[PDB]
Structures are given as structure tokens and as C-alpha cells.
Amino acid sequence: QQKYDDEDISEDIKFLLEKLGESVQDLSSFDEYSSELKSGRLEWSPVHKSEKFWRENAVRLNEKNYELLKILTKLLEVSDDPQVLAVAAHDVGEYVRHYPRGKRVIEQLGGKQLVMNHMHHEDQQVRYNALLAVQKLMVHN
Amino acid sequence: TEFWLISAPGEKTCQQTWEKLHAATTKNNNLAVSSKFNIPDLKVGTLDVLVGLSDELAKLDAFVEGVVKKVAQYMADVLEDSKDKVQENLLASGVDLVTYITRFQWDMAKYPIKQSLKNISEIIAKGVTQIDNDLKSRASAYNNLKGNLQNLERKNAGSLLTRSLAEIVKKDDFVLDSEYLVTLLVVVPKLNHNDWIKQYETLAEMVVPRSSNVLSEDQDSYLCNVTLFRKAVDDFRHKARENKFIVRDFQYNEEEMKADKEEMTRLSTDKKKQFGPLVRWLKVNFSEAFIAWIHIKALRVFVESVLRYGLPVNFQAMLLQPNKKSVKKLREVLHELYKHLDSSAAQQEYYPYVYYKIDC
Amino acid sequence: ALSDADVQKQIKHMMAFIEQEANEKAEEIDAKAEEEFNIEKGRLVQTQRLKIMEYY
Amino acid sequence: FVAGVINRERIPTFERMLWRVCRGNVFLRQAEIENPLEDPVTGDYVHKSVFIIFFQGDQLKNRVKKICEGFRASLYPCPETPQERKEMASGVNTRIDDLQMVLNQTEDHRQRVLQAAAKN
Incomplete structure (x- = not known):
């Protein structure tokens, strides 16, 4: 934002910004997310805020036998880490704000009863993410 | 010619029959x-x-009325021995409006009894569209005839400056069969009658002195003949325009004047020849329309x-001639008779x- | 405006309307049944006529 | 013939309008609600009373659709005679209560956040 007359550092910021741009594009992918979720490991990353993975690849979140959603659904009860659980709640919130029949899929999976508990699960970061996910959940409702 | 076709629900058919007959059942004490x-x-x-069908039939009746009104406008246009008060209500089927309505029946020829009412409306639609097609075609013919007749009348209009000189120029003063002489049909004001006659002597050479003589007298000016040589015309007209003079070169040829006179004669003949069958066919349309309309x-x-x-055909048909400045009591007594029976509430x-309006 | 009896009268109004419509569809189906009865008679008899004529 | 939602304010005259369409033609379905929630249009608590004229034919059904649309009249409900409709409605109503308590806790979060922000 603050321009310098140092053309050298100008080109430096240029190539760094573009290179880290394609790097974050490479940290923005469906399959790496599937790998991370299958590893029982979740941490706030560009993947968890990767809007292209969220809106364009939501139909991909309907992976075979809904195993991705099943991993999330079983994490809704076996995940005893508040932060990983928060990430899962946010991801579910996205999957509901994008695809309403996926919403009804989750309703069939019974995740709403588990999520209700997160709306009142000690940690205040857990209240917030449960409330936000359900706020997404209440479209057409 | 205000009238209203009244319908009764028909609680008991004889009761409604008595309602639509007697003087007491006639409102205003039979003033109607x-x-x-x-x-x-x-x-x-x-x-x-x-x-x-009810909605499209309201719309249909609408344009139907529009059509026969247009007709009446055509009747007023033609004025073929017919005035707005003379033969205004042509006696369709030999009868006027009231006798026709009282005498009216389902047109068997137009449809049988068992024809579904929707199909009858479709038949009426086809008939009225056909009538309207004929009306616009006849209108086109009449418009052509009228415009041509108006042009014929305009041929004989205007002063002698711009009016056809077909009744004016004569051969005896209009010099033909001479490559030398030629007659200028000068236009000279009556106030300048002797003046320009005198000054035409010396406007140019190769001239005949003071040959300017009256041909035909108009209201403010008059056409006149001046005989002079052909190349004299150029200098004559030049010095004429210099002195605020008027020269019109209306060339003589008898055959086109004869042709125009025969043209207006034959167009008058075509006018009456069209007007006869036209009024006959329009009588036919008036009757056909009026019948289909009722x-x-x-x-x-x-x-x-x-x-x-309810479901049966309990229903009686009536015609009404409302009394003048007493329709209020007519309507009030009709309310007293029917509105309380309309429903338990009102x-x-x-x-x-x-009851629905009619005025031919 | 309408007691129970009068609303029932309107109900019977529509009953009679569907009486007539039911009769219309029933007699239409019957007339079409006889039409197809005749038509299929003609078609089958014509086809067997062709077969037998070929044989002979 | 499903009871709609009208605010009892133009019922005597909307009945007159329904009569001018067809005077006393079909069954009238009645209902009434007291002390209703704040309206979606203005937020008022005007009491509701409704009387509905409904037609089974297609054109007349569409005509009454036009009439009810020409006025502030809601005809959303589409019930069904079997009890399954009412059972699903009751389950939905449990979800409605869930939405109510969700609204409560969201407001709780809102107010605590605003107090935190305003403190500084």
C-alpha cells in the first residue's frame, strides 16, 4: 500500500505476493482436505477458509457413501478437542449454507442433535461456532 | 329507446309468470x-x-355492439336517402325493437336446440368476424369512391389561376396549326382589366398589337388571350414578370377534357351503382346483427x-320499458320484491x- | 345468508353438476368403447381375411 | 375451503366482495385467533378473524386466487385429511420452538458482544 521508490523491493514484493498466491492456491484444494479429515487432524488453514473449495466443490463434499460427512458426524461426538470440533462445526456450517439437500442429508444423519449440544458446550468459541452453523442451518426454516 | 331484459330466479314458475304480467306486479302502478x-x-x-363463457361473452357482446355502432356511423356517412331519424330503427324481420324482443326466439337456422352453448357462441363469433370483414371491405370501397369523387369536385374548384381551364380555353382564340403564333392565356385582374390589356402591346417585338381579349370572367380576375410569335413569348413573359404580370401556358387538347368529363360521369354512375346494393346489403347486416345480438x-x-x-331451468324472461323519472321507484320496488329473497342476509x-340495458 | 340447509343446497347443486359430468364421461367412454369395438372388429377381420386369402 | 389469515378488519366487507364475485355460492370456512404475534408486514398485534370462500373448479379457483391477491390475504396453508399432515406439522412445531430458543441464545451472544465492544 505504501509505495516506495525502491524499485528493487517493489519487484521483491511483487514476486513474493504472486508466488505465495499460487502457494495458497495449492493450499486450497478438495483432496488435501479429504486427506486431512481422514487423518483425524484439523487446524485453521487456508483450506478451512478456501471459498473455492467451499462453493465450487460442495458437490464433492458428497464423496462416496458420504464418508466425509460421516467422519464429521462421528467427530461431532468423539472429538474431545474444542478447536478441532470448532473446525468441524464451521465446515458443517459451510456445507449447509451451500447445499440445502445436503442440509437434509445432515438432518437424516442426526448431526443437528449433536450440534445443538455445541450451541451449549462449555467453551465460548464452541457456543459461537455452533450458533453460527445453526444460523446457516435455519435457511428455508 | 331504453329497455331492460329482466330475469327472475324462478322460485315457482307460475309466481314469476304472474310477476311479469300484471299491472300491480308492474312497477310504478303500470307506468312502466x-x-x-x-x-x-x-x-x-x-x-x-x-x-x-360468461367472461368471453361479455367481451363478445362488447365488440358486437362496437361493430353495429360503426354500422350506424356508416349509415350516417352514406346518407343514401336515409336520415338519422328516418328508418333509424330498421324493422328487422318486419318488426321494430319492442315487438322483436317480445317476439324473439332462438334462431333455429343459426343453430339447433341441442348445439352446446359454447359452440353457438363460436358460431356467433365466426358470423360477426365475417360481417366485420365485409364491413371493412365495403368501407374500403366507399372510401375509394368518396376520395375519387372529392377529387372530381376539386377539379372544378379554385380561381382561374389553379383550376382546370377545361371549360375555358377555346380554339378560336387559342392559335394552333401555326408554328409561328401561339396564344398566351394571360391572367388579368378585373381591377387591371384594361390596364394589362393595354400594356401587353409593347412587352416584346414580333407582336400583334393589343390582341388581349377577354376569354372568361371570374370573380377577381379573368383569363384572356394574347396572340404573338413563338420566340416573342420569351421576351413577352420576361417583361411580363418584370411588371408584375401573370402568364399561364395552359396547352389545349380536346380529348383529355372529354376524357375527364366522361370520368366524372362514369364515377357518378359507379357511385349510385354501388350505393344501391350497398344499402340493401347493409339492411341485411343490420337485421342479422340485431338478431344475433339479442x-x-x-x-x-x-x-x-x-x-x-339452483340447478333446474327455473327462469323467466322479461322485457322492461322503464317509466321516465320514476326508475327510482321501479328499482326500490324491485328491491322490496327480490333483495330480501336474494339471501337470508340481504x-x-x-x-x-x-336486468340489462338496451338502446338502439 | 346461508344456514346449514342452504349450504347443503349448494352442495347438492354441485352434486347435480357432477351427476351430469359423470354421465357425460360414462356415456362417452361407452360410445368410444363401441367405436373401438367396431374398429377392432374391422381391423382383425381384415387381417385374418388377408391371411386366409393368402393361404387359399 | 381452508381458513386463511385476515386481521378481522376487512372481513365484513371482504365477504361482500366474495359475494359480488359469486353471491353465496359455496361453503364458508371460519376460524379465529386471539392476541397474535407481531405481524410480518407492520408488526401489529391486531386480532385475526377469517372466512374463506373456495372453489374447486380450475377457472374459479384461479379467480379467487386473483381476488385474495388483490387484498392482504394469505392462503399459504395446504393441509390434508390424513393425520400424517398434522403429525409432520407437530414435528415442525417442535422445530419452531427450537428456533425460538436459538433466537434467545443468539440475542444473548449479541448483547454480551456489544457490551464488550462498548466497554472500550
């Missing part, structure tokens, strides 16, 4: 006229399409009837009894 009326009818088993109105009445009460909004 209540004549009974009857027609054949038909059965309909679906009311959805019936109310559809049928349309009767059908629409029957439609409202079947809409506004215009476009409230309308316990049915």
Missing part, C-alpha cells in the same frame, strides 16, 4: 311496461367453462341465471335481480 317473454334453452353440466344478450342472461341460483357489487 312489464311484458312476459320465453325462449328455448339448453343444459350445461360444467360451470367452470360456463363462467369462462340472442347474445339472452344467452348471457341465461348464463347469469344458471350462475345465480350494480357490480350488489345485484339481487337481473
